[PDB]
Structure formats: C-alpha cells, structure tokens
From a paper:
The U1A/U2B″/SNF family of RBPs is found in the U1 and/or U2 small nuclear ribonucleoprotein (snRNP) components of the spliceosome. Both U1A and U2B″ employ an N-terminal RNA recognition motif (RRM) to specifically recognize their RNA targets. Here, we report crystal structures of four states of dSNFRRM1 at 2 Å resolution or better: the free dSNFRRM1 (residues 1–96; dSNF1–96), dSNF1–96–dU1SLII, dU2A′–dSNF1–96, and dU2A′–dSNF1–96–dU2SLIV.
As in the dSNF1–96–dU1SLII complex, the overall structure of dSNF1–96 is not significantly altered in a crystal structure we determined of a ternary dU2A′–dSNF1–96–dU2SLIV RNP. G17 is thereby pulled below the first loop nucleotide (A7), preventing dSNF1–96 Leu46 from stacking on the loop-closing base pair as in the dU1SLII complex. G13 of dU2SLIV adopts a syn conformation to occupy an equivalent position as C13 of dU1SLII, sandwiched by A12 and Asp89 (α3) of dSNF1-96 and hydrogen bonding to the backbone amide of Asp89. U14 adopts the same position in both copies of the ternary complex, resembling the minor conformation of the equivalent C14 of the dSNF1–96–dU1SLII complex, with the base occupying a binding pocket on dSNF1–96. In addition, U14 is held in its position on dSNF1–96 by Arg20 from the N-terminal pincer loop of dU2A′, acting like a lid.
Numbering used by the authors:
A (entry chain B): -1 to 93
B (entry chain A): 1 to 175
Write the structure that this text describes.
Amino acid sequence: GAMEMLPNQTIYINNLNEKIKKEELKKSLYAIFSQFGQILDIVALKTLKMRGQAFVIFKEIGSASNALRTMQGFPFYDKPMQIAYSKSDSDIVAK
Amino acid sequence: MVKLTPELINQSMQYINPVRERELDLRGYKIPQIENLGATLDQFDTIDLSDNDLRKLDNLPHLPRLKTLLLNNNRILRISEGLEEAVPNLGSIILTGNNLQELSDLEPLVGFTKLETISLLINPVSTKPNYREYMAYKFPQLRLLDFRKIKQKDRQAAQEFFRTKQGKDVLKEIS
RNA sequence: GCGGCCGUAUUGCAGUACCGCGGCC
Ligand SMILES: [Cl-]
C-alpha cells in the first residue's frame, strides 16, 4: 500500500456528488464540518481533474482528526464521503 | 459562567467566511443563554454559536440580515415560538449535536418562510419513527435535511402516508 | 430565460471568471 499521512489540519474528501453546484457544495461542506472546529477555508473546483473533491482546512489538527474519524463514509447528498489527510500542507496555513 | 456581552461580541472575530459571507465567531465561550445580540447591529449573514452551553434557542433581536445559524454542540432542548419575526430570512439552521427530543419540539420552526436547510444530526429527534417523512410533510419549503435532499417523490410519499389512518394516528400523537 | 426526471463518463491531492456529455417531460 501507499504511505499513510500523519494527522494534518487539512482533510481531503472525494467521491462527492458531482451534480451539486460548486457554491452549494461548499456551503453544505461548511455546515456539516463546522461541528468539528473552526474552518479556515474550503478548496473545491469543478474542472475535470478536481470535481468530486474538496479540501477542508481546519485551524486545529484535532478538529481534522475528529472530522475524518466521524464522517468517514457519511452519505452526503446520497454518496458516501471518502476522507483522508491531504498529501501536502495547505497554502493558507503557511507560516 | 460566561455572559454573552457587547464586549465579547466586539472582541470576537468578524470576517468574510469560506462561503463569502459576513460571520461573527462566538464559538467555544461556554455561553449559557443568548443575549445582547442586538449589539451586532445586524451586520452578519452568519453567527457561529457552536460549542457553547445553550439549553434553548430564544431571545433573538431583529436581525434581517441573518441567513445562517450555526448551533453545533450545545444542549438545546427547546426553541422559542415566533422567531421568524426576529430572523425572517433564516435560510439554514445547523443544530447538529443538541438535545431536541420530539417531533412536536420542531413546531417552532414551521413559520420560517425561507428555511431551506436543517441539520438535526446527533439529536434524539432524528431517530424518532417517521422523522424524515414528517419533516417533508410539515415543512413544504425544506430542501436539504441532514445533508440529504428531500426529493419531490419523498414529499409525495409522505403526504400519501399521512392521509392514511396509520399516518393520521401518528400526527394525532405528535400533538 | 427557469426547472423536473432519467442515463452516462471522469474516482481525480487542490488553491478557482465559469465548468462534463446525452435523452426525455
Ligand atoms: Cl489553502
């Protein structure tokens, strides 16, 4: 298997329902993940490469860890969320 | 324990959030009661009262700009009636992680004319019998419930159910 | 201009004008 990521403040979500308009997708991602902590930003595009995916950037690593553990497979707009730590640090958390 | 004060409001983060709206951050202060929100001067699209110790949703001043309420992880078990007079344009109410118990406890949300999104995840009421059906039937304008859409076919089926004797009995008991 | 329904392709690690295509009602 590939290398696992140590806990990061950013979670990567894919298998998202691609029919949902981008604005509404970000709005609903913000609402459902707001339970876990302060969210610094959400990065979601609907290009061919990046649609069906989103990065949710938390201020605290603990918030991301709970988000990942709790929401894994949650049926968001009737598709189960696939959630992982991101493979790189998000720009907005740069020192 | 804390009070929600004008100074607490003035010293909290007041910023453009990730969905481009004006948000007041009141998360994590162990606030026991809503008060003094009039001091916001109706500046915010969104108020984040996540992670406090509210036991009821009440005591709102007139805030026509307010469109999203984040109420994650409080202890809310009652909503005051008639809040649509204070916050008529409320479009989403996020009550994830609270203590609302019965379908009749949601009665106070009915008069919001623009309320298109509700989360009652991690509330006791979300596992009551007939929960999703009832919500479709009782809130005609509700579009997204616990981040699953209420489809027209869902609402048709609910309305057909509540016209049966079984459904009628369910409604009788909810009252 | 504004929707509804059905299907189909992409399962993709990013920082955004915008975002796949097709069939019915
Ligand atoms: Cl970023």
